[PDB]
Design a protein around this ligand. Structure first.
Ligand SMILES: NC(=O)C1=CN([C@@H]2O[C@H](COP(=O)(O)OP(=O)(O)OC[C@H]3O[C@@H](n4cnc5c(N)ncnc54)[C@H](OP(=O)(O)O)[C@@H]3O)[C@@H](O)[C@H]2O)C=CC1
Ligand SMILES: NC(=O)C1=CN([C@@H]2O[C@H](COP(=O)(O)OP(=O)(O)OC[C@H]3O[C@@H](n4cnc5c(N)ncnc54)[C@H](OP(=O)(O)O)[C@@H]3O)[C@@H](O)[C@H]2O)C=CC1
Ligand SMILES: [Cl-]
Ligand SMILES: [Cl-]
Ligand SMILES: [Mg+2]
Ligand SMILES: [Mg+2]
Lengths: 688, 680
């Protein structure tokens, strides 16, 4: 069902200790801590490295040779085991980086999966439950349920037969020599993973595939499992968390109300365990961290999308902002243009702190900014800040080349909730918390009747657990049917990102492009161009918002007829993006409908600059004329621009024509077509 | 575009006061008490009736004409203070109506005489504000109700004409405002008998909100079978539902069916009954439990659960009185004793002040007959009235079901082990949270900023310990991925439920399930158990266990093809569909499937019935006979029932089999000989 290096894989059997969990390094630490406690001297690193693979008796005899015959090894070993369970039970089993990502890929590939551990059923199940990876496995095969353990192939042969499979149909993952022998002899496809000790030549010769760590196998596996499709609206996020952290530099409208969704979807197999987001807004920070989650409201479908595993931090706080740029695998800069200059310093400090970090992988930096050459601006200011910070041109140049700086095109319009509306929301929901908290004490008491199954010692201990659990959880039962709404966003899913970063390859809500130019040109003419032309019409007709204006059937007709004339033109210029034009065309008309929040002021800024020969208006006219297409609405849009310039911005009527004639001359048209365009456009302006 | 009784609908503009919420009755009582604390003399009831669906401005004009700011301010303060304690009284049906209209693709709004500050406070509180694109209040209107401006401005902001929009209203004044707008007016009675003038103005009339819902529902697409990991609805209706028996199938299947519901709304509360206290206290502590689908390693969280005691009477009466749908999920042994608890509940429902949809989940040929027999005997004993019983029995919808899904309940040992592990994480979490002021003016007053700090600090204190539940789940059930339940036609409610498929000849399917499905399932489980396997999934990996099950399937199908020639075509699909579910049932234990061997070895049950059929028609029953022998072998060895009792049962059941004396003695001789052979 799953093809791996030309071999059909129907099953996957994992060793537990050293392969799935990092319990061999923990057993390394506990032995040292137990030694320092009892005998006073800590067992050498060198001794413990020598003991890897040896029996408990050989290890004891070796300890006797080095630390004397009367060395209390058996009670050192027993004390080390106490320390192991004590650590594992509270702090959790240490899971190898990339395991959960690997398990989700094998499971969604329809593999039957087992564990073949030398440990006992009892302790094995607890570890797998503790780690929350028990769910991934159909059967567990244990050392206390086989006549001959590893390196005899029984445990792997048995694990395979229980899954209804031949050994040769299964991948077999293992760290130890005896284990790899057991898996190999059974006749399975052996995956050897280095844990602590470098594997000897006999092991590397024996193994079918070798990797230095789990993540190196994950990278190999990724070639044989598909990138998932574009997520639909109301589609769930993955349940399983990977060990990666991601960042959103600027927890604003687009940061919290769009980028959060993309990072929450991730690759569809797993999602990050933590999303760090920076804001100066104290109310927003403390509110999200209180709930431990916020929600994005999609008005069109009346759907509240819960974003979990969020951790909001202060932008002014260094320790927190450095922790973002140190631990994050991917970061999304979601700032306005004016903020880029000031925030270039706190980025530089972040990337320099990452460079100085003695722990690792190149950062993927998404530039979320609706502007042409948006990446150039950030990289220019970032370079200046890095020089000013370090005064080391070689280090500054290294940092600028190490990481993946990605230019993006975003289409989703998002609205951030006001602090007045947030306070009003917190008041009404704190009210429900009090309403909820007065009838939790109405229940009261814990009662566990005689099970006639559980012993009275553990029956008593069960009462203490559930009582302690209920007391802490019951107050937060209201969160089931209660959300913290901070964002009102449209339904547009796909983000376009510059191809380069390996980490983007599997991100399902991302559309990779070799160069951003093409989709950035569509964004300019089809979206920003119509938005500006539609805003100039609304402003002159005297409507407060572009959303209100759509009530007037003249405005809505103009909008629908305008996106049609532009789309026609772009289809000829970019036939490869035909599907992207149709999707973006409707997406704009949907968002424009109830666009009450966003004003026309900021959209109608610099009309003369937007009426340039190679810009979002005139370029579309010239394209439509060259390929003989209707441009009557684009002409009306251009006129409304010069009309808006004269009336609102107090531009001279002579200065408008002075500009116009220079733009028409620069268009790739016949001298006949140029003079015809001027004559028509000037008459539309004098009417308005 | 929605087609409501022929007319095309593009939008829907509701009234708030007395249409969406029952706030007209509240402000009625506040204005009276407001005119007692201040001026002393209460307002006339005639004045208040003429103030229905009037703007605070227009109501003040009526007051001066007969005889207010101070009066209404105190009245509004009292009104919203009542809302802070009890909540907004949502008219039953509203949430269900709104979701159907929203998903139909209609452009919806609110047109209320109330001002903005109040209008939003309720719409947020009720949590219906998300369903509306725009709202029109009594502020931004120049001339309030009964002038049509407020309903014209509402339709204008939706970018539609009034005649394209539905208009919901309670007041006589507001209906005139809605009618003069030239829209499709709908009238909902609240606290005034509609006049001749009102009933003529209206295009449609309904007694209450829920009466419209039922009429609207026949123009709303019925959503089809849900997929595995498809989410449940977000919005909650006011309906309660019951699971009589929080067991494997009750908690691990029926809970999913009820949680999906119609796909528009979900029950407010699902009440499940269990004697198991650990299960009860565990779910109530977490507030949720999860169903583990091992095939796809997917955990399905079940929200809005209330686990009650089966013995506790008042809680079981709470279920049967307020529930719209009860699901009986008990085995045969429980039916007799629990029929007393059902009798009290149904009698309590009749005494109190909608019909009930009663699902019987029971693997028995003639399941409903047994349930209805014990229920009538139980009812008659308590009521001592034949007139009230024959009404109750033929008032509610008692539905036979076929359930194909295999589900496993978690052991108390494994649940304790789960709680022990997850408690250690909670303890370590509570240390991390130990070691808040909202600083700077965020366009808020110093009073609000200090009030916000108290709200957030208190919210953090209560919620922060429960943050761990984002990742942490309570796993109580292991279930395969079979979605559709098959129910007999009758109950109109089951038409609209997504996960329910309606059928006619339920008896014919129930018989085939008993013999071909549940019979082979039990017999291979006995063979697997005695061979050493503790899992159905692992056992089916054995060539002998699968060869046995395949041979049984063949012998049963050969007999069913004679008894039911009209179903003979379908047997291959069902027999294969069974083996598919068995093949990879790794978390389904043999012990669960091999329960009650003697009951399953009854003369008219999943083993002996097949043996009897094949003997009459001279069909081979060699493997079927071996499975019966393994059934008694399991009972004697694993359950320990005494060998003498196993023979006394064997001899009695063979005596009941519709065979000749020659066949009876030969069957007894062949079977008892084969039992002693296994123990050799
Ligand atoms: N939202 C949209 O409709 C779309 C926007 N975009 C792009 O997304 C980017 C952000 O949009 P949006 O999120 O709406 O911007 P916001 O106005 O919501 O603020 C965004 C973030 O920038 C921070 N910020 C703003 N000004 C400053 C400043 N002067 N100094 C320091 N930090 C500052 C804010 O901090 P605090 O949180 O403390 O305010 C916030 O976290 C813009 O570049 C825009 O072009 C792209 C397409 C669509
Ligand atoms: N699960 C499955 O795979 C399928 C089950 N079914 C049918 O559903 C019915 C039971 O399903 P299942 O849930 O598996 O049974 P379970 O034993 O798993 O659950 C039993 C439920 O009934 C209650 N109960 C059991 N015995 C008694 C009794 N003697 N007196 C009172 N209450 C009792 C239990 O209460 P407590 O919680 O206190 O034990 C529990 O709520 C049977 O008819 C079965 O054939 C249908 C198809 C397959
Ligand atoms: Cl990982
Ligand atoms: Cl309802
Ligand atoms: Mg190992
Ligand atoms: Mg009214």
């Amino acid at each position: 069902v799953l093809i791996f290096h030309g071999k059909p894989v129907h099953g996957a059997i994992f060793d537990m200790d050293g392969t799935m969990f990092d319990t061999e390094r923990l057993r390394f630490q506990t032995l040292q801590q137990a030694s320092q406690e009892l005998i006073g001297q800590e067992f050498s690193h060198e001794y413990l490295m020598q003991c890897l693979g040896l029996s408990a008796t050989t290890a004891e005899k070796l300890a006797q040779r080095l630390y004397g015959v009367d060395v209390p090894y058996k009670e050192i070993r027993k004390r080390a085991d106490e320390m192991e369970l004590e650590h594992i039970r509270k702090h959790g089993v240490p899971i190898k980086k990339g395991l959960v990502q690997v398990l989700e890929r094998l499971r969604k590939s329809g593999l039957r999966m087992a564990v073949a551990t030398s440990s006992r059923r009892a302790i094995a199940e607890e570890y797998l439950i503790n780690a929350n990876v028990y769910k991934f496995f159909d059967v567990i095969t244990c050392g206390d349920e086989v006549e001959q353990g590893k390196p005899h192939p029984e445990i792997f042969l048995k694990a395979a037969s229980q899954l209804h499979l031949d050994a040769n149909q299964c991948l077999m993952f293992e760290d130890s020599e005896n284990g790899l022998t057991s898996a190999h002899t059974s006749k399975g496809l052996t995956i050897l993973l280095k844990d602590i000790k470098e594997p000897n030549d006999e092991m590397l010769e024996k193994a079918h595939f070798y990797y230095d760590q789990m993540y190196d196998f994950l990278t190999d596996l990724d070639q044989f499992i598909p990138v998932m499709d574009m997520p639909e609206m109301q589609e769930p996020f993955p349940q399983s968390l990977n060990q990666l952290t991601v960042g959103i530099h600027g927890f604003g409208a687009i940061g919290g109300g769009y980028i959060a969704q993309i990072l929450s979807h991730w690759d569809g197999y797993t999602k990050p365990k933590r999303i760090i987001a920076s804001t100066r807004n104290s109310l927003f920070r403390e509110a999200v961290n209180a709930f431990g989650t916020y929600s994005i409201r999609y008005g069109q479908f009346s759907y509240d999308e819960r974003i979990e595993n969020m951790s909001i931090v202060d932008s002014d706080n260094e320790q927190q902002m450095l922790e973002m740029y140190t631990h994050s695998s991917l970061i999304a800069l979601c700032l306005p243009e004016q903020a880029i200059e000031s925030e270039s310093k706190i980025i530089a400090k972040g990337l320099y702190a990452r460079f100085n970090s003695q722990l690792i992988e190149p950062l993927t930096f998404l530039i979320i900014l609706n502007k042409v050459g948006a990446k150039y601006l950030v990289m220019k200011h970032l370079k200046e800040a890095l020089l000013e910070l370090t005064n080391d041109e070689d280090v500054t140049e290294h940092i600028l080349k190490e990481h993946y700086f990605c230019d993006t095109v975003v289409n989703r319009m998002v609205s951030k909730l006001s602090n007045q509306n947030l306070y009003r929301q917190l008041r009404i929901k704190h009210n429900f918390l009090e309403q909820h908290l007065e009838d939790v004490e109405q229940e009261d008491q814990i009662e566990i009747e005689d099970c006639n199954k559980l012993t009275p010692d553990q029956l008593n201990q069960a009462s203490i657990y559930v009582d302690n659990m209920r007391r802490n959880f019951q107050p937060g039962h209201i969160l089931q049917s209660m959300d913290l709404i901070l964002f009102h966003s449209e339904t547009d899913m796909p983000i376009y990102v510059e191809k380069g970063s390996p980490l983007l390859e599997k991100l399902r809500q991302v559309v990779l492009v070799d160069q951003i130019t093409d989709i950035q040109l569509i964004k300019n003419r089809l979206w920003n161009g119509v938005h500006a032309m539609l805003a100039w019409y609304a402003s002159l007709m005297g409507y407060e918002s572009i959303g209100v204006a759509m009530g007037d059937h003249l405005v809505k007709a103009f909008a629908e007829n305008l996106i049609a004339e532009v789309k026609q033109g772009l289809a000829i210029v970019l036939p490869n993006y035909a599907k992207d034009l149709d999707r973006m065309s409707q997406s704009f008309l949907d968002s424009c409908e109830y666009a009450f929040k966003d004003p026309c002021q900021r959209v109608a800024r610099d009309p003369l600059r937007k009426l340039n020969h190679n810009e979002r208006v005139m370029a579309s006219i010239a394209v439509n004329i060259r390929h003989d297409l209707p441009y009557k609405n684009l002409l009306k849009g251009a006129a409304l621009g010069y009309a808006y310039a004269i009336q609102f911005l107090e531009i001279e009527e002579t200065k408008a024509v002075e500009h116009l004639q220079q733009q028409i001359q620069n268009l790739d048209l016949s001298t006949a077509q140029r003079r015809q365009l001027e004559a028509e456009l000037v008459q539309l302006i004098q009417y308005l």
